[PDB]
Design an enzyme around this catalytic site. Structure first.
Site, PDB file in Angstrom:
ATOM      1  N   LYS B  78       0.784  -1.293   0.146  1.00  0.00           N
ATOM      2  CA  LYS B  78      -0.127  -0.109   0.058  1.00  0.00           C
ATOM      3  C   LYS B  78       0.853   1.002  -0.125  1.00  0.00           C
ATOM      4  O   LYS B  78       1.668   1.527   0.995  1.00  0.00           O
ATOM      5  CB  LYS B  78      -1.173   0.143   1.013  1.00  0.00           C
ATOM      6  CG  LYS B  78      -1.695   1.244   1.340  1.00  0.00           C
ATOM      7  CD  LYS B  78      -2.542   1.447   2.744  1.00  0.00           C
ATOM      8  CE  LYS B  78      -3.023   2.660   2.982  1.00  0.00           C
ATOM      9  NZ  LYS B  78      -3.528   2.864   4.228  1.00  0.00           N
ATOM     10  N   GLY B 359      -7.123   0.936  12.472  1.00  0.00           N
ATOM     11  CA  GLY B 359      -7.786   0.117  13.309  1.00  0.00           C
ATOM     12  C   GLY B 359      -6.609  -0.773  14.030  1.00  0.00           C
ATOM     13  O   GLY B 359      -6.599  -0.961  15.150  1.00  0.00           O
TER      14      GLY B 359
HETATM   15  C1  LIG Z   1     -15.135  -3.242   8.881  1.00  0.00           C
HETATM   16  C2  LIG Z   1     -14.025  -3.156   9.523  1.00  0.00           C
HETATM   17  C3  LIG Z   1     -12.860  -2.677   8.394  1.00  0.00           C
HETATM   18  C4  LIG Z   1     -11.748  -2.452   9.316  1.00  0.00           C
HETATM   19  N1  LIG Z   1     -10.653  -1.846   8.286  1.00  0.00           N
HETATM   20  C5  LIG Z   1      -9.274  -1.732   8.765  1.00  0.00           C
HETATM   21  C6  LIG Z   1      -8.280  -1.329   7.702  1.00  0.00           C
HETATM   22  O1  LIG Z   1      -8.516  -1.015   6.616  1.00  0.00           O
HETATM   23  N2  LIG Z   1      -6.771  -1.001   8.339  1.00  0.00           N
HETATM   24  C7  LIG Z   1      -6.529  -1.608   9.721  1.00  0.00           C
HETATM   25  O2  LIG Z   1      -5.460  -1.583  10.165  1.00  0.00           O
HETATM   26  N3  LIG Z   1      -7.809  -1.981  10.492  1.00  0.00           N
HETATM   27  C8  LIG Z   1      -8.927  -2.438  10.036  1.00  0.00           C
HETATM   28  N4  LIG Z   1      -9.965  -2.812  11.038  1.00  0.00           N
HETATM   29  C9  LIG Z   1      -9.468  -2.922  12.305  1.00  0.00           C
HETATM   30  C10 LIG Z   1      -9.126  -4.477  12.586  1.00  0.00           C
HETATM   31  O3  LIG Z   1     -10.136  -5.494  12.049  1.00  0.00           O
HETATM   32  C11 LIG Z   1      -9.560  -4.406  14.220  1.00  0.00           C
HETATM   33  O4  LIG Z   1      -8.545  -3.308  14.815  1.00  0.00           O
HETATM   34  C12 LIG Z   1      -9.367  -5.687  15.096  1.00  0.00           C
HETATM   35  O5  LIG Z   1     -10.659  -6.233  14.881  1.00  0.00           O
HETATM   36  C13 LIG Z   1      -9.336  -5.286  16.641  1.00  0.00           C
HETATM   37  O6  LIG Z   1     -10.430  -5.215  17.337  1.00  0.00           O
HETATM   38  P1  LIG Z   1     -10.920  -6.667  18.143  1.00  0.00           P
HETATM   39  O7  LIG Z   1      -9.952  -7.569  17.596  1.00  0.00           O
HETATM   40  O8  LIG Z   1     -10.778  -6.421  19.412  1.00  0.00           O
HETATM   41  O9  LIG Z   1     -12.313  -7.269  17.319  1.00  0.00           O
HETATM   42  P2  LIG Z   1     -12.599  -8.678  16.892  1.00  0.00           P
HETATM   43  O10 LIG Z   1     -11.848  -9.119  15.785  1.00  0.00           O
HETATM   44  O11 LIG Z   1     -14.060  -8.697  16.652  1.00  0.00           O
HETATM   45  O12 LIG Z   1     -12.356  -9.936  18.166  1.00  0.00           O
HETATM   46  C14 LIG Z   1     -13.277 -10.204  19.230  1.00  0.00           C
HETATM   47  C15 LIG Z   1     -13.003 -11.215  20.063  1.00  0.00           C
HETATM   48  O13 LIG Z   1     -13.625 -11.267  21.085  1.00  0.00           O
HETATM   49  C16 LIG Z   1     -13.720 -12.675  21.660  1.00  0.00           C
HETATM   50  N5  LIG Z   1     -14.612 -12.985  22.698  1.00  0.00           N
HETATM   51  C17 LIG Z   1     -15.749 -12.164  22.754  1.00  0.00           C
HETATM   52  N6  LIG Z   1     -16.308 -12.697  23.674  1.00  0.00           N
HETATM   53  C18 LIG Z   1     -15.778 -13.582  24.387  1.00  0.00           C
HETATM   54  C19 LIG Z   1     -16.030 -14.447  25.627  1.00  0.00           C
HETATM   55  N7  LIG Z   1     -17.013 -14.556  26.370  1.00  0.00           N
HETATM   56  N8  LIG Z   1     -15.080 -15.402  25.856  1.00  0.00           N
HETATM   57  C20 LIG Z   1     -13.862 -15.618  25.252  1.00  0.00           C
HETATM   58  N9  LIG Z   1     -13.603 -14.582  24.322  1.00  0.00           N
HETATM   59  C21 LIG Z   1     -14.402 -13.862  23.805  1.00  0.00           C
HETATM   60  C22 LIG Z   1     -13.685 -13.553  20.498  1.00  0.00           C
HETATM   61  O14 LIG Z   1     -12.489 -14.637  21.028  1.00  0.00           O
HETATM   62  C23 LIG Z   1     -13.250 -12.590  19.573  1.00  0.00           C
HETATM   63  O15 LIG Z   1     -12.432 -13.301  18.572  1.00  0.00           O
HETATM   64  C24 LIG Z   1     -11.373  -2.827  10.516  1.00  0.00           C
HETATM   65  C25 LIG Z   1     -12.550  -3.399  11.385  1.00  0.00           C
HETATM   66  C26 LIG Z   1     -13.757  -3.594  11.062  1.00  0.00           C
HETATM   67  C27 LIG Z   1     -14.673  -4.022  11.640  1.00  0.00           C
END
Ligand SMILES: Cc1cc2nc3c(=O)[nH]c(=O)nc-3n(C[C@H](O)[C@H](O)[C@H](O)COP(=O)(O)OP(=O)(O)OC[C@H]3O[C@@H](n4cnc5c(N)ncnc54)[C@H](O)[C@@H]3O)c2cc1C
Ligand SMILES: Cc1cc2nc3c(=O)[nH]c(=O)nc-3n(C[C@H](O)[C@H](O)[C@H](O)COP(=O)(O)OP(=O)(O)OC[C@H]3O[C@@H](n4cnc5c(N)ncnc54)[C@H](O)[C@@H]3O)c2cc1C
Lengths: 519, 518
Positions: B78, B359
């Site tokens: 990129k 993100g």
């Molecule tokens: C539409 C979208 C577009 C994006 N585009 C970009 C981009 O272009 N460039 C970039 O750098 N980033 C991007 N991101 C960012 C990246 O995908 C996120 O930063 C990443 O998901 C970090 O947040 P998260 O992992 O906490 O959420 P999630 O990926 O949803 O992880 C959720 C976790 O919660 C855990 N969990 C929930 N409840 C429990 C429970 N009771 N017990 C045990 N485990 C549990 C699960 O194991 C699950 O895996 C984007 C995100 C989204 C939604």
């Protein structure tokens, strides 16, 4: 299409005015016409000025004046640190350190860089050892090479000229101001008028229209620079901008000062400013060539002028009846706004704090840097003024807080003054910084904008706070997770001990280097 | 007193395994780390776009060279974000529309803005624009990259020499799995499959332990909430409020998919596309042999059905059978990211639409700040407050920068574009706008600390603001006093044209370089 600034009038021909004339004259290079108005005043003794390293990189380098050129013509000496004397022990004002814990009561604040080890400053390892009983050495002697070579009045430069540490300058400001007057009038085309301001005319927006002098001459400009000192002839008197007194943070408001001749051949030259704790204040010692400037900064609420004069003269064995003395009562604080309408204050017309950390000239060229950065056009966009004003107020308020901490955390309780300092309150932002310090954090851990933001950083806070005896509650938390770093730091400390030994043995005295540089 | 001994990470997505890898690296066997991950319904790899310090601030810290992780993750390069159709009216289309004789696009490259006499080239460009000496767009005048991005050039020559700053496109699922293997096999992080059912707090309000559905009880000193939008620890257990920031950003939904792509026939675009729509914008994130794409839209202005239709039609996909992911999201951040002994990392902490690729950055930036402010068992509260302040301004500054993309678009053709102009800029954003309009260089740019504080700087504000058509009221006042600089800057612009021409003629295509790397 508003149009650029065409005419600048600087009011005041002291150090600040001639720094402003030079800095503005240079950055503009013929684009604008600059006149400086200077009144015949009774002159004062050359009591001295202590500076900081970016006087060269931020100010003289900007003017195109190499350090050799200006330094020789102003008979300047070298400053490697501030040495704080008797801030921790009860007693009278003496130039001689008292005995504290089997040694002399002093500690250094050097311009030297603090080594990092595995991305953490050596300070944090030193305190971890102190806390765990593995050392009892003072912070500055543990973590810097400079203290032992300062104890021997060594030069910061080898006779061949190579530099072994960071340093700044000691000089009589009058000589730099004359040097800059010559430079600005002879090479930059600044016009000097000798005259007294008698009347300032303002227009319907409250901006300055013109200044009329006692001979009846009238000067107009697009931008007025107030360099009139504590009087604030334009910013305070004409424009009616309030001065914000800040004596709820700093009790010192007076000084008595002189210049003392010194036998450099018999005693060498000290490569540091001394800040000597007194009963109702502190006394500076700024060594120069064959003389040192010195002054007792005190608080009129705790000592009379007569008491201050006595204490000051007794400590240097001077005759109060015949020593030439300057007395002054100053204001402590800053204008509510440094720049209002078409009027910008630069120097003590803008803000003042006691010279305990050598900020006076720094405040001038730092504000001049900010003024050029925010330089207006004829529209005088208010955002340029607002941003400038915010830089000035944090420049000053940060320094004010740092200086208050020198008194707030002194252990002394032996006079009403030292006890009174402990009844003042720290500003919220300074209380936060102290909390950060005590939690093991590194404040503002390490180009002029970076120096401007990080003037008081982790090095400075450990030098002063740990020098005075305030240390963190417990070792910094990351160290317990870095067993390899904390076991290998032994070699970093020993490296410092090596440099202390090797420089002590190979460095010339400052006197020897200064003789060579002149003759 | 005493160090932290035990850490429980709750959540095993991208943020959880990033946190497991970063903390595991930094602590080196001075703490026992466990991660609780429950099985979740898998989603399509809709793509993730990043920033150059993913390597310098994250993978380098782990000791993982760029080649190593790129190969297991099928990553592409990129070089910029390319903004398409933000200045012209019409339907959501992948083709740039007509604007002043050229395509309606502008770039936000990673490359560095040149200075001339201590002043950014942006100010000289606008001075010439204002005096009628130029009509060239800001990005084509001041950056070499736009010309070679138009031709899908690689940021590295075939011999590997790098000619411009670049970041990565990839499937986040693949990076998370790579990191899960690394943390468990190289760093001793313990992975436990299980679902959190109950969180036990003590009388000080700190978390004591979490109980899972199998009845197991996990106790720890420090709890890291990586549970995503659910905020199982920080919002549900600690009851920290969430600050809804939909008064600054109207988008709250997305529909996304993955599209197969013949790289041999069409090449690979070395940029993220941000394609304006009638009620939002659509990302396009090229990967190897496919591209991820998603429509970020505002439910106030488009039903999910309309958004599915608009999005499928622009790619010529079947709304009835195309595999799609649909999400509704909360925009904002917790009142405080770290409360008591509970730190939130990832979307459990904050979220904003991915319009400027932040993100994944929010994760490793927060993890850098967590290690900097790492507590001992006394949890000195200034560490927490300073951490919370770093996160708060990280987010609010990004939120403001993103709102400016919509606030200063010239479009008025749909209720969405009109409604954006009716929102209010935060006071701090308005001051930045005022500064920009007065010719100042905001956070003038040159170590992650220099990067974290100056994320959005003068280069970034000009790319987006000057790209959308907001420019200063008049030339920067210093320039009228620098006649030698303004007369000699002719050759600085000339040097840019020379790099544009030379790199265009000698660089391989991104495709050609990628083929060779495999
Ligand atoms: C539409 C979208 C577009 C994006 N585009 C970009 C981009 O272009 N460039 C970039 O750098 N980033 C991007 N991101 C960012 C990246 O995908 C996120 O930063 C990443 O998901 C970090 O947040 P998260 O992992 O906490 O959420 P999630 O990926 O949803 O992880 C959720 C976790 O919660 C855990 N969990 C929930 N409840 C429990 C429970 N009771 N017990 C045990 N485990 C549990 C699960 O194991 C699950 O895996 C984007 C995100 C989204 C939604
Ligand atoms: C006791 C003391 C100790 C200090 N120690 C240090 C130190 O160690 N290191 C350091 O860096 N700085 C130090 N400083 C700071 C130093 O004084 C300032 O940096 C410098 O003086 C800036 O202020 P100034 O030039 O405006 O003041 P001044 O030198 O007083 O200039 C005043 C100018 O006001 C003009 N003026 C006033 N009224 C009129 C009028 N009607 N018409 C025309 N002209 C008028 C005068 O012509 C005069 O030239 C110290 C200051 C003081 C007071």
């Amino acid at each position: 299409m508003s149009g650029k600034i065409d005419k600048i009038l600087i009011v005041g021909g002291g150090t600040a005015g001639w720094m402003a004339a030079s800095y503005l004259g240079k950055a503009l290079q013929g684009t604008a016409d600059i006149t400086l108005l200077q009144a015949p005043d009774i002159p004062t003794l050359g009591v001295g000025e202590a500076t900081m390293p970016n006087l060269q990189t931020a100010f003289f380098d900007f003017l195109g004046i190499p350090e050799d050129e200006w330094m020789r013509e102003c008979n300047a000496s070298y400053k490697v640190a501030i040495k704080f004397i008797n801030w921790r022990t009860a007693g009278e004002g003496t130039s001689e350190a008292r005995e504290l814990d089997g040694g002399p009561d002093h500690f250094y604040h050097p311009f030297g860089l603090l080594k990092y080890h595995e991305q953490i400053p050596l300070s944090h390892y030193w305190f971890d050892r102190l806390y765990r009983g593995k050392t009892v050495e003072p912070f500055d002697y543990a973590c810097y090479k400079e203290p032992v070579i300062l104890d021997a009045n060594r030069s910061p430069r080898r006779l061949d000229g190579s530099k072994v540490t960071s340093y700044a300058w000691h000089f009589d400001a009058h000589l730099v101001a004359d040097f800059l007057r010559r430079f600005a009038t002879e090479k930059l085309g600044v016009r000097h008028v000798e005259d007294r301001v008698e009347h300032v005319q303002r227009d319907a927006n409250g901006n300055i229209e013109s200044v009329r002098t006692a001979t009846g001459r009238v000067f107009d400009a697009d931008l007025f620079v107030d360099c009139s000192g504590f009087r604030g002839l334009l910013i305070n008197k004409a424009m009616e901008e309030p001065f914000l007194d800040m004596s709820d943070h700093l009790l010192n408001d007076s000084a008595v000062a002189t210049q003392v001749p010194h036998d450099d051949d018999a005693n060498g030259v000290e490569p540091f400013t001394s800040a000597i704790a007194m009963k109702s204040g502190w006394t500076w010692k700024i060594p120069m060539l064959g003389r040192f400037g010195t002054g007792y900064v005190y608080s009129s609420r705790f000592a009379t002028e007569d008491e201050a004069v006595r204490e000051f003269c007794e400590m240097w064995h001077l005759d109060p009846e015949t020593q030439p003395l300057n007395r002054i009562r100053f204001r402590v604080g800053r204008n509510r706004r440094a720049w209002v309408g078409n009027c910008v204050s630069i120097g003590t017309s803008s803000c003042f704090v006691e010279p305990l950390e050598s900020t006076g000239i720094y405040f001038v060229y730092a504000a001049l840097y900010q003024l050029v950065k925010h330089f207006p056009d004829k529209s005088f966009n208010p955002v340029l003024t607002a941003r400038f004003n915010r830089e000035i107020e944090t420049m000053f308020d940060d320094t004010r807080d740092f200086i208050q901490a020198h008194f707030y955390f002194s252990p002394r309780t032996d006079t009403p003054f030292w006890r009174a300092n402990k009844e003042l309150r720290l500003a919220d932002g300074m209380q936060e910084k102290i909390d950060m310090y005590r939690a093991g954090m590194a404040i503002n851990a390490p180009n002029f904008e970076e120096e401007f933001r990080n003037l008081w950083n982790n090095s400075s806070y450990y030098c002063v706070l740990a020098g005075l005896g305030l240390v963190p509650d417990a070792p910094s938390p990351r160290l317990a997770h870095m067993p390899r770093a904390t076991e290998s730091v032994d070699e970093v400390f020993g490296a410092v001990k090596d440099q202390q030994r090797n420089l002590l043995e190979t460095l010339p005295s400052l006197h020897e280097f200064l003789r060579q540089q002149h003759g």
